[PDB]
Write a protein that binds this ligand. Structure first.
Ligand SMILES: CCCCCCCCCCCCO[C@@H]1O[C@H](CO)[C@@H](O[C@H]2O[C@H](CO)[C@@H](O)[C@H](O)[C@H]2O)[C@H](O)[C@H]1O
Ligand SMILES: CCCCCCCCCCCCO[C@@H]1O[C@H](CO)[C@@H](O[C@H]2O[C@H](CO)[C@@H](O)[C@H](O)[C@H]2O)[C@H](O)[C@H]1O
Ligand code: NA
Ligand code: NA
Ligand code: NA
Ligand code: NA
Ligand code: NA
Ligand code: NA
Lengths: 400, 401
């Protein structure tokens, strides 16, 4: 069908713009500390974004489909064209911002696109205001939770690793611990929410994976910590390797939360085209997640990695231990949001995480100018994309 | 729950012995080409063995639970003591062989253990001969299939890489193709058999993972192929790095097929303690698979770091393209066997794959006294473990009563 080809193209363009605008949220810690080149960061992210999208991305895709527009108050064909309009408008504005090196929330963009459609097609009652209010609350709370976690974690690492009688030995315990906790979070959430297994099985699998991870990472760190004789340099060299893993953690969580910004709308179009109805129980077709994940990966490789040769527009000049802490806090916050089905901004979460570290260490950094740009974009994106989606939808109803 | 504790200890020891004896089967190619150190090989295998055990290990575990002993002819309590007897006996012989550095089949060992228990408890009727027959058939067919796949694949490599106008450019396409095929196989089987999703969805996910894998590996190879000027040196350098991936593939498939050799007996004990009669359809308790996976990983790390760098010395003349091919063919054979629920020997499959790509092999060297020892141990392991398991079971039955 022409509608399915158009929806495939527009969903691919949305996903590509997500990958382009958001790679920095994952890879700027590792690239800024020169733990990896821009090209290695792009290849790794290509894999980890796709993996997060597949293992965990349907939960938020449900919310995007049903949690913004009151879909029952809309005709199926209307929902189809509203999804496409939202994709058109979000994609346009994201690609514009990426052109100018500007960071935007692709989540805020697609949600404003959906809101624009719903307001034009039905009016004020075309919007699911209760769910939308919870989403806006999460938009404000998640950056603060990220800052809070990064604050507490930076302090804990300073106390238990650096300002300690034997930093090397301490680091061989602390860095495995955080890698294992990341693995436990991913595995237990995947087994409970995606595989539908009971809570006890999910926990047991998470513990088992975290035990294997701790063992292996401990012995690798033990090898690495004796490559340098200077203590601080040895610790930082180990954090340098480990913050690649924690970048992968962020890129996974990003795919998990954000594939919805392309797959939710695409899934809405696919379901309406295939059935002619809007079913009460939304199931996200796997083609939608795969299209979105591959699109994000390709955007990472072909337009991202140039965004990042300019500079990591969202986290750069910290030590390896600080990048490690920023990544961990960001990924944990985003994965927990995804487990609740909340579409949040990974951009604003990483900004919150680095602000938290700055409050912990010394307020020089954060760069207040980019912080101001983030706040301006934050305030403008939802109204702008909403108005654009409303106009695109309006025009589109020139259909006989 | 004393019986549960004893089962945990014995299953752990068996799993440890598997990891110790078999890490060579996946990592000796990579270690012998010096693509990685023994220590690195051990850490990688630790993660990949556990991952295969957890993602794909339940299917062969079901066959170990009811494909050797005729479960409906043994009282459940006796099945529980027989499972323990088999674990004790197999572990003992695996550890003896490992201590001398000899690669043996832990699958042949545990099946012999179970057969021995079944024969002493019930006689000729205590053995599930219909299924045991297909298992022995697979023990004969699997190494041959590994050799054949090996041979055909090395021919494919020659045709598509070496016998071409621009072998660097060709390797840039052929190595990503095989890495992608490996990923397609792992994913499609995991989604189909473990997660029990429809065939079309399994294939669709396998293909998407393949596409991403091909893209990423293609650009990594494009980079690597530029490090050496000479065509053949550059291609072998790329195979040298890619055969690390293919060693991971073998490790995963090894965990998938062999966690059963410890998890099947443990599961049988858990099922009897929990419900009594072994039900129509067996569900392997994840605890069994997790214990088996952890024990294999720990055996790889604490003991396998000896027999690995004893198989590896014998194949340091194996080209990187051949080690790549041997691993791919071994892992494919073993994964497909696992998807059929067949408990297979990965040792014999590796040997088959090696003979299929060509053997320098130093042979005569190996020391022919050692080669004779290896052949003897392989022909004798099933009856030796069966007899040891029978003895342990009867001794046990007494000491109890
Ligand atoms: C290293 C590779 C590991 C990642 C493998 C990819 C996992 C793919 C997950 C597919 C989704 C799991 O399958 C899920 O099944 C339950 C059925 O109760 C529900 C949905 O049908 C489906 O989402
Ligand atoms: C880094 C990659 C991580 C891979 C994920 C590792 C966890 C894999 C555990 C798979 C758990 C198997 O869970 C399976 O779910 C199906 C769904 O119908 C049911 C089965 O009883 C169960 O075997
Ligand atoms: Na990082
Ligand atoms: Na962004
Ligand atoms: Na999001
Ligand atoms: Na062996
Ligand atoms: Na190898
Ligand atoms: Na086996």
């Amino acid at each position: 069908m022409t509608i399915l080809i158009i929806a495939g193209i527009l969903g691919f363009i949305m996903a590509f713009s997500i990958g382009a605008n958001d790679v920095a949220n994952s890879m700027a810690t590792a690239v800024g500390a020169r733990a990896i080149t821009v090209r290695q960061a792009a290849l790794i992210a290509m894999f980890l974004e796709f993996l997060g999208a597949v293992m965990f991305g349907s939960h938020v895709s449900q919310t995007i489909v049903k949690g913004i527009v009151e879909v029952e108050k809309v005709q199926p064909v209307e929902l189809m064209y509203g999804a496409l309009s939202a994709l058109i408008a979000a994609s346009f504005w994201i690609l514009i911002a990426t052109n100018w090196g500007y960071p935007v929330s692709t989540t805020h963009s697609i949600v404003g696109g959906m809101m624009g459609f719903g307001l034009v097609a039905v009016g004020i009652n075309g919007v699911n205001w209760k769910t939308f209010l919870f989403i806006v609350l999460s938009w404000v709370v998640s950056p603060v939770l990220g800052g809070l976690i990064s604050f507490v974690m930076f302090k804990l690492i300073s106390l238990s690793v650096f300002h300690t009688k034997n930093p090397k030995k301490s680091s061989t315990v602390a860095i495995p611990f955080f890698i294992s906790l990341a693995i436990f979070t991913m595995i237990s959430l995947f087994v409970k929410k995606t595989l539908k297994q009971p809570l006890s099985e999910s926990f047991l699998l998470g513990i088992a994976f975290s035990l294997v991870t701790f063992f292996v990472v401990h012995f690798a760190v033990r090898k690495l910590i004796n490559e340098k004789k200077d203590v601080y340099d040895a610790v930082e060299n180990v954090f340098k390797r480990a913050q690649i893993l924690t970048s992968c953690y962020v890129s996974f969580s990003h795919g998990a939360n954000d594939v919805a910004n392309a797959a939710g709308p695409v899934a809405a179009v696919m379901i309406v085209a295939s059935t002619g109805v809007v079913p009460k129980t939304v199931e996200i077709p796997f083609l939608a997640l795969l299209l979105g994940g591959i699109g994000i990966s390709l955007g990472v490789f072909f337009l991202g990695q140039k965004v990042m040769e300019t500079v990591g527009e969202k986290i750069t000049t910290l030590t390896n231990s600080r990048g490690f802490t920023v990544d961990f806090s960001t990924a944990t916050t985003v994965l927990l949001a995804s487990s609740l089905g909340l579409p949040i901004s990974t951009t604003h979460v990483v900004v919150g995480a680095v602000t938290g570290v700055g409050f912990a260490r010394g307020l020089e950094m954060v760069n207040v100018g980019v912080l101001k740009n983030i706040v301006i974009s934050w305030l403008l994106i939802v109204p702008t994309v909403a108005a654009t989606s409303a106009a695109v939808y309006w025009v589109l109803k020139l259909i006989l």
